[PDB]
């Protein structure tokens, strides 16, 4: 039932991450010579979350305050001194509350393989592609499939002459 | 409770718009 | 349901990001010339906040009173000297409440990939371009996209012979 | 559903300040001899503020009183001196209410890309356009497109020969 | 009833694991020529999780203070000295609530078996594959699969000659 909807839900971002790569991956490298394929991790448990954080006081140039007694004695007779100070201090301090309901359908982590083919010439011997052709490619997947190292995103891009 | 904050934060919203 | 809305949501922002840097690229590099694909990273979270700050008044310049005693008192007879200071303040602070409800569907971060052609003369050989170009492509780009540093935006353009 | 008209709100935001722009660089430039594209980081979130300030009195220059109790003794019998100062002193302060409600889809940091062709003499040569001439375009989209530097506006115009 | 529910969302999750990895292995090692099979270990346990937490107080710098009462007391008479000191203390904490409910069917452990065929070239020599392909075929499969180290995913591809 809801475990379906949520399976299509991922095939589907799964399919449109698949084809903005190789939306960009077809003009240079050609139709057909570029095949990838993307798997999703998705988020589909139910969070709710409050946080309250409160501004430190206890420094006296930002501490904030309402009432405050200070009784202050000295009886001096070190000999027989007596000091005696009494102080009592309300503060008021800064207070945010945070409530934050997470999406239901985020990404957790992305992994997507992509395999290339070779350049066959007019000749048509399949030439392999260059190290720094390889780095661009790399470089627009990365883009393409939204690449961050906080939620773990590995890529993985080989280059092997496709099959007849 | 987690509701009992955001009660809070509502009642916070409405002196807010109380001032 | 909610979840294929909120894609439809994501992919008319991609598009009209792409449009936006197609616009802007095609009158230089030429229709065609160029080809650009745009992801985004979502805010689908609904989120509520209240915030609440105090203005220090820890400096008697700045400190708003409404009530003060201050009982002194001092019996000389340094000696059997005696001082007392009994002192009581009572405070009006600034006070600043700020609701805040934060729009959903607001945007995290945003990759864009962007490729362009090489150019051919009227012989016909791809004569790629230079760095200068490349630079203006890359600004012209930063621009469309609303390149931002806070949110983590990562842009990529590359220079290559576009396929038959 | 509300993202679709927000979307929109920002779309024509953007179309005006584009045409806005096109106004004032096509008597100089020429028709077609300028394009320029606008993005727009708006704000759809409800805030509501309200701001408290109370004017200091802690200087008896612009202190106001409504009651106050000055009791002094001094017996002297420094000797047998015994000073007593008991002071209350009641206040009225300055209070000054803000109550703020920010409109909903103002901007918040405005973005501007423009590119300029060159200019085809009788002969038709591209002669490229003067530092001068730059410098006037610059100010005059800065003047079009509202510039500020507290938003975060960034505005970049170059340079270019266009395309058949 | 429910235990086949779960044993379909199973199958249909392998099957669609199963055509992921099919559909990259199959342009470079060939169409017949790679079969593999995915067993998964899932979640069918509800749970519901309540998180709080507070930050620590106990440095000074960092503590958020309401109301402080400090009493002290000097008699000095070491000789017959008499110190006192009553510090009472009235802390606001920062608090997070966090309320989790995990979803229904999130995959626990998943362990794939790939095999592969060997090459047979046009004499018909079934020449075995290589160590860079096979390492190939396990980075490629890994990706499709989401291979991660926290479940504890087990991967395992072998070359071995297909059976008329």
């Known amino acids: 039932d809801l475990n379906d909807a949520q399976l299509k839900f991922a095939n589907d ?4 991450i698949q084809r903005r790569i190789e ?9 057909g010579n570029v095949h990838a394929q993307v798997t999703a991790q998705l988020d589909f448990a139910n969070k709710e979350q409050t946080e309250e954080h409160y501004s430190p006081n206890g420094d006296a140039s930002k501490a904030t305050l309402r009432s405050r007694q200070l009784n202050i004695s000295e009886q001096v007779g070190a000999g027989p001194r007596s000091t005696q100070r009494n102080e009592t201090s309300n503060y008021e301090v800064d207070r945010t509350i945070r409530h934050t309901k997470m999406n239901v359908g985020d990404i957790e982590r992305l992994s997507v393989a ?23 490619i790399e470089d627009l997947t990365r883009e393409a499939m939204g ?16 099959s007849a | 409770a987690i509701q009992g904050i955001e009660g809070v ?5 409405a002196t807010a718009m109380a001032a």
């Open chain 1, 13 to 16: 971002v799964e399919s449109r």
């Open chain 1, 23 to 31: 939306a960009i991956l077809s003009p240079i490298v050609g139709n």
């Open chain 1, 114 to 136: 992509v395999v290339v083919n070779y350049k066959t010439l007019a000749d048509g011997k399949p030439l392999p592609l260059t190290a720094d052709q390889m780095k661009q």
């Open chain 1, 147 to 162: 690449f961050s190292d906080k939620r773990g995103d590995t890529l993985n891009v080989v280059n092997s002459p496709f």
């Open chain 2, 9 to 13: 934060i509502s009642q916070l919203q």
